[PDB]
Amino acid sequence: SNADDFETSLTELEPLEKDAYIVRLVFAGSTTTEPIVSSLSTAYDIKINILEANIKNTKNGTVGFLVLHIPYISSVDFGKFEKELIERQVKMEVLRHG
Numbered sequence: 001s002n003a004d005d006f007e008t009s010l011t012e013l014e015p016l017e018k019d020a021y022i023v024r025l026v027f028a029g030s031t032t033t034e035p036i037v038s039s040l041s042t043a044y045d046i047k048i049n050i051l052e053a054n055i056k057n058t059k060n061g062t063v064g065f066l067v068l069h070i071p072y073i074s075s076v077d078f079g080k081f082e083k084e085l086i087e088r089q090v091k092m093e094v095l096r097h098g
Contacts, residue, residue: 006052013069016098021070021078022051026091029061036088037066043084044077046070067095 010022027033033055041048052067073081085092 010051010096014096016096017071018098019072019074020098021073021094022096023068023070024093024095025066025068025085026093027055027062027064027066028089028091029063030088030090032057032062033066036090037068040081040084044073044081046073046077 013022016022025033025036030036033053037048037050040046047070049069049071050066051069052065055062055064055066082092
């Protein structure tokens with residue numbers, strides 16, 4: 001399946017280094033993803049690699065998800081990163097970590 005192939009592609013990026021993550025960001029009626037990804041990168045001085053985007057920009061805002069590879073972020077900054085997403089009503093799922 002597509003979900004099986006997707007998971008196979010994440011597993012191919014393993015092992016991740018300590019302090020590296022693959023996360024999924026879940027959007028359910030938010031403003032656009034771009035100002036959010038560049039904003040997050042600026043705020044934490046981090047590289048963000050977009051692995052996958054499956055997004056619709058609708059009348060009622062942005063719906064869908066981004067899968068992001070973050071090659072390094074400190075444990076303290078990762079907590080702040082998630083909290084900022086929570087405040088924007090974006091859910092964050094941890095798919096892989098090092």
